[PDB]
Amino acid sequence: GRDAVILLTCAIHPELIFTITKILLAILGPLMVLQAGITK
């Protein structure tokens, strides 16, 4: 749940989880959404 994971996120491999959050926002792909099953 909460009130524990946030503490473990900054205490256990914080330099790696932050990088995942940055890629998490880039995993959507606003341009890719306009190319799903296109040009057929």
The CATH classification of domain 1-40, taken from the options 6.10.250.1610, 3.40.50.300, 3.40.50.620, 3.40.30.10: 6.10.250.1610
Domain boundaries, the chain: 1-40
Listed in sequence order, the residues at least 6 apart from 14 whose beta carbon sits closer than 8 Å to its beta carbon are none
Q: What is the DSSP string of 1-40?
A: --SSHHHHHHHSSHHHHHHHHHHHHHTS-HHHHTTTT---
Give the C-alpha distances (Å, rounded to integers) separating 21 from 12, 15, 17, 35, 36.
15, 11, 6, 24, 24
Method: NMR
CA distance 30 to 28: 6
Neighbours of 13 (CB within 10 A): 12
Task: State the residue for tokens 């959507």.
Answer: 28
Report the amino acid identity of residue 12. Answer: I
Spatial contact of 9 and 17, defined as CB atoms under 8 Å apart:
yes
